[PDB]
Amino acid sequence: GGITDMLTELANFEKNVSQAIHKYNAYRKAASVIAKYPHKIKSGAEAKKLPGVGTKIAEKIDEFLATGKLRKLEKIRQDDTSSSINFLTRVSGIGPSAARKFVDEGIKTLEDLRKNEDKLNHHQRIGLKYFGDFEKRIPREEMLQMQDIVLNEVKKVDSEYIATVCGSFRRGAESSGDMDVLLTHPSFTSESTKQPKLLHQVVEQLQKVHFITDTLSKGETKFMGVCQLPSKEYPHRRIDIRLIPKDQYYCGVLYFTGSDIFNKNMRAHALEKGFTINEYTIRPLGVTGVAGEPLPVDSEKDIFDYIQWKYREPKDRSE
DNA sequence: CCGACGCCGCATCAGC
DNA sequence: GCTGATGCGGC
DNA sequence: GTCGG
Ligand code: NA
Ligand code: NA
């Protein structure tokens, strides 16, 4: 736990302060595989056999193990610029660029943000408004309640809407972090249109039953906002609603359910058997390497069929 | 040694 | 006003 | 920062 703590700390710092995005992904992967090793690590070199752990992280692992600290992370926990940037990026809509600029002109705390509302954009004010509620997990039976509303609410506007709640939730996790719902209708396909306001008429509707309460961003395919159960008053939760063409929905569902490691191996195994998977389509590879036209997917198993894989129910789409 | 490392929708801004 | 670039969240 | 062509 200590090692993966430290690694993750180095990641957030490289993302938020350094803006070294790839250094951040490297610490992240380094931390994930260590978090999965089933022994207490005893030397740097030991982890060095792992994929993503190289010469510099193992030198840090040795220092941590020898001393219980990392001098570099200490210098970073001092230095008020780094910590205030890092803190401010916890506000949704406040990224490394906004955070750095804020601290440059003295905007360092949540309260500094309150006093400077006029200096925030809309997404940032909402993120600030729900700062504490957004950092708190969503337990399963709450999602189910949240599921029961979106599915039932979107059935009312048009029973030919098809909606699926994905993420950890549908893989069966007991905790969720937000609510990812995918959405389709007979009108909308990659070849055409037939209906202008499909995703609008969902959002307008869950607004009227006062479930959706704020909008971070909205257009004709992606919505981002806040939602909440009816009344203690329930905490506000993040929700995304994604409208996807029918011919790509099930590739959408397969993708947005995960995990990232299950898509990792299914995509790589698809290549073994001659197919390439993206969040949209499964397409064949000519023996020259060029992809063909998208195959048809009517259900999730169709994708599993092409690459000749036994279907893995979302519950065990972990590895 | 050295470039790759994720790619996209929406909001906002720079630059005309 | 237009269009293209960038910040942002996040699977 | 680690990996691989
Ligand atoms: Na290694
Ligand atoms: Na943020």
Side-chain angles (χ1 to χ4, degrees), chain A residues 1-27 29-41 43-58 60-69 72 76-77 79-100 102-114 116-136 139 142-144 146-153 156-158 160-170 172-186 188-189 192 196 198-203 205-227 229-242 244-245 247-260 262-263 265-271 274-282 284-286 288-300 302-309 311-312 314 316-318:
Chain A
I3 282 170
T4 57
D5 284 341
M6 157 196 71
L7 287 187
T8 300
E9 265 178 279
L10 288 211
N12 299 330
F13 165 84
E14 301 293 345
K15 197 204 308 155
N16 299 328
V17 198
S18 290
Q19 317 212 354
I21 184 53
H22 293 114
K23 297 227 219 154
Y24 153 76
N25 287 310
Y27 284 120
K29 72 171 297 192
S32 74
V33 290
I34 289 175
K36 195 202 48 198
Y37 190 69
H39 314 70
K40 277 215 313 294
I41 283 162
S43 78
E46 186 190 348
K48 182 100 177 68
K49 321 159 181 179
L50 311 189
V53 182
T55 171
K56 284 211 62 186
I57 284 175
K60 267 141 195 131
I61 293 199
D62 296 321
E63 173 176 344
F64 187 77
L65 283 179
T67 76
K69 63 139 60 187
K72 164 194 199 77
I76 295 181
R77 281 184 198 111
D79 171 41
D80 182 45
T81 294
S82 298
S83 41
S84 315
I85 281 66
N86 227 1
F87 175 70
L88 280 206
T89 70
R90 295 166 66 181
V91 179
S92 181
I94 297 193
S97 163
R100 166 140 276 159
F102 279 143
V103 168
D104 268 333
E105 63 201 25
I107 313 290
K108 294 141 66 150
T109 52
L110 287 182
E111 190 165 85
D112 295 338
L113 285 170
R114 327 201 160 264
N116 290 274
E117 37 162 337
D118 83 303
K119 292 166 103 87
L120 301 185
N121 66 46
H122 175 68
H123 179 142
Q124 306 180 316
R125 295 154 187 145
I126 300 186
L128 158 68
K129 179 176 192 205
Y130 300 118
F131 183 84
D133 276 352
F134 279 156
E135 295 209 315
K136 73 169 49 166
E142 293 177 350
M143 301 302 298
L144 292 144
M146 300 167 68
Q147 182 164 47
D148 276 340
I149 294 322
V150 293
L151 286 178
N152 170 68
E153 273 311 321
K156 305 159 71 160
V157 51
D158 197 322
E160 280 174 317
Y161 276 116
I162 301 192
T164 302
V165 187
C166 317
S168 55
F169 170 81
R170 151 174 145 138
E174 198 267 6
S175 291
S176 282
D178 56 344
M179 186 131 174
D180 279 296
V181 311
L182 278 47
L183 191 99
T184 319
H185 179 265
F188 186 46
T189 74
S192 164
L198 287 146
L199 168 74
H200 186 77
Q201 291 288 59
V202 175
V203 175
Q205 164 68 9
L206 302 118
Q207 283 172 342
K208 304 220 148 262
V209 292
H210 302 139
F211 165 86
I212 273 168
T213 77
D214 303 89
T215 297
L216 300 162
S217 66
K218 158 171 172 307
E220 182 204 345
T221 45
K222 191 171 158 222
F223 166 93
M224 291 180 110
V226 196
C227 67
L229 289 180
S231 39
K232 319 151 269 158
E233 202 201 20
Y234 276 110
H236 286 78
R237 314 293 201 179
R238 270 280 291 118
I239 183 181
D240 288 8
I241 304 187
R242 242 182 287 246
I244 309 185
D247 45 326
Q248 304 172 347
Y249 187 70
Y250 287 99
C251 288
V253 186
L254 175 86
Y255 184 71
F256 294 113
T257 307
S259 54
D260 292 308
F262 173 78
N263 294 327
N265 263 126
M266 210 189 155
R267 267 200 307 246
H269 180 282
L271 290 173
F275 306 88
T276 169
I277 303 300
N278 64 14
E279 76 152 293
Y280 310 112
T281 73
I282 173 170
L285 290 171
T288 59
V290 65
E293 288 277 33
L295 310 178
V297 312
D298 310 279
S299 67
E300 257 190 54
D302 289 345
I303 315 169
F304 280 99
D305 289 332
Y306 292 126
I307 66 178
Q308 278 274 70
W309 256 28
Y311 176 77
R312 311 248 304 285
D316 295 39
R317 265 173 226 186
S318 324

